[PDB]
Design a protein around this ligand. Sequence first.
Ligand SMILES: *CC(=O)Nc1ccc(-c2nc3ccccn3c2NCc2ccccc2F)cc1
Ligand SMILES: *CC(=O)Nc1ccc(-c2nc3ccccn3c2NCc2ccccc2F)cc1
Ligand SMILES: [Ca+2]
Ligand SMILES: [Ca+2]
Ligand SMILES: [Ca+2]
Ligand SMILES: [Ca+2]
Ligand SMILES: [Ca+2]
Ligand SMILES: [Ca+2]
Ligand SMILES: [Ca+2]
Ligand SMILES: [Ca+2]
Ligand SMILES: [Ca+2]
Ligand SMILES: [Ca+2]
Ligand SMILES: [Ca+2]
Ligand SMILES: [Ca+2]
Ligand SMILES: [Cl-]
Ligand SMILES: [Cl-]
Lengths: 5, 5, 236, 236
Amino acid sequence: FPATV
Amino acid sequence: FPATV
Amino acid sequence: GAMGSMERASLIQKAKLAEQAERYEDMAAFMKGAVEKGEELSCEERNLLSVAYKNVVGGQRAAWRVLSSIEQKSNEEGSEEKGPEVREYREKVETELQGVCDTVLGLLDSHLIKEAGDAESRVFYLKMKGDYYRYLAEVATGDDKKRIIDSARSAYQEAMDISKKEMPPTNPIRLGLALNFSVFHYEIANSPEEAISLAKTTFDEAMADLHTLSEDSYKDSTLIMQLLRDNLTLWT
Amino acid sequence: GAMGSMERASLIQKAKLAEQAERYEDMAAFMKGAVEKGEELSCEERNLLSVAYKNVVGGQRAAWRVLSSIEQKSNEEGSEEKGPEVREYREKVETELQGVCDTVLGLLDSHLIKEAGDAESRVFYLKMKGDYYRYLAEVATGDDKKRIIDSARSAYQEAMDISKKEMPPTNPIRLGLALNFSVFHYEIANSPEEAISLAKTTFDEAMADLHTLSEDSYKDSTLIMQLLRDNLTLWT
Ligand SMILES: *CC(=O)Nc1ccc(-c2nc3ccccn3c2NCc2ccccc2F)cc1
Ligand SMILES: *CC(=O)Nc1ccc(-c2nc3ccccn3c2NCc2ccccc2F)cc1
Ligand SMILES: [Ca+2]
Ligand SMILES: [Ca+2]
Ligand SMILES: [Ca+2]
Ligand SMILES: [Ca+2]
Ligand SMILES: [Ca+2]
Ligand SMILES: [Ca+2]
Ligand SMILES: [Ca+2]
Ligand SMILES: [Ca+2]
Ligand SMILES: [Ca+2]
Ligand SMILES: [Ca+2]
Ligand SMILES: [Ca+2]
Ligand SMILES: [Ca+2]
Ligand SMILES: [Cl-]
Ligand SMILES: [Cl-]
């Protein structure tokens, strides 16, 4: 899964 | 802390 | 509300204790109580709110993905029929997740966003609105799926417009917003090219502004820039 | 009970799904529902019950320790007065923890232990009874603290007596019981010499019986033996 903040 | 199961 | 009798300052204090104890459900409940006092939130308080709900919904999303994967496998050719239980339990977790998203969106609509006038608060809350509609979109399969997606897009877009006008390209809120909107494009909107373009442009414009920053600001901006790079590496 | 309308087999199935999704509160609620159907539990089912509640109470204990440490620091000389919030929140977590222990002890008393006739089931449940009284003892400070400690001791002792008579020294239930009773001695009963003696004797008697075991049984017994060794290393 891609990075989110 | 010591090991318990 | 169950937190109605507790002082605002005590709710904030206990949110911080809950964080230390990794009690994120408690942390979220305390911060919901704090929001419902009706006063605006400081920078620190906004980040307590976001951290709390991010952890709660993050756990729900991870569980939902596990259960969805099991459910998908059960509907493959050659899979033995095991009854309604997998679907039921996935639905249970899904409903709980939707409930948390609705709670967060409710706080934003009543009345955090409408009283948020400074760029740093308004962009922060609109990013949250985009994120929680995105989480709803991840589990949506029905007639309103397109409208949920468009609600996420619309919130992100308003946040982007404000951030570009009012914030420097290295601002961590601006950077995090762009990171997440880029993921929205890739994972939700079936728009990988838009996702890549946004991540690259965001990264490059931040790089060009790093020279203006103190050491501490540099550290925080470059952390998020690395996440943009990580996604670009994943996608290219 | 909320699980009263769900099939026993469906509760078990969902407990296993909850475990896969790391949803231990759900797992515990499903297994409580299964117990309340009134039928005895199989080996696998007993271990689903134990795993579920171990994870729930384990998280509570970790949180309680964090908060207790903060509270202790607040009562040191030179510490600024921050009001009742730390105590209140520690008490909240403590009450929740006691509630879970009481729930587990309630299931054991109504009616798991009384219907457990085989050594493997009876020892398993009595070990659980000792463990959950031990967790109550960890947070006890009042008039019944001695009685809580003695309740833990009594359950462990009955389990020990049965296990020595009816099980081989390598039996994993016997080994785990001894590990935990040894920790009870060290951490609760202020009896470090008893703790050390029990761990050493248990280890040595298991070592002498390993030759009787299959590869798979050997693997499982030696895992717990290593924990006995680890505690002995910590304590000597
Ligand atoms: C006042 C305010 O909101 N300031 C703020 C918010 C968020 C951060 C921040 N920097 C980093 C670096 C690396 C990982 C995570 N962060 C955060 N928190 C997550 C987050 C939340 C909202 C927007 C962006 C964002 F990164 C720093 C300062
Ligand atoms: C039928 C039955 O109860 N059998 C059983 C129970 C428990 C285990 C077991 N082996 C190991 C090795 C290493 C770590 C943990 N375990 C477990 N589970 C924890 C546990 C629970 C109760 C008693 C002892 C114990 F170790 C194997 C077989
Ligand atoms: Ca007040
Ligand atoms: Ca079934
Ligand atoms: Ca649904
Ligand atoms: Ca305002
Ligand atoms: Ca500005
Ligand atoms: Ca790649
Ligand atoms: Ca039935
Ligand atoms: Ca205070
Ligand atoms: Ca108390
Ligand atoms: Ca029986
Ligand atoms: Ca036997
Ligand atoms: Ca040592
Ligand atoms: Cl369910
Ligand atoms: Cl509290």
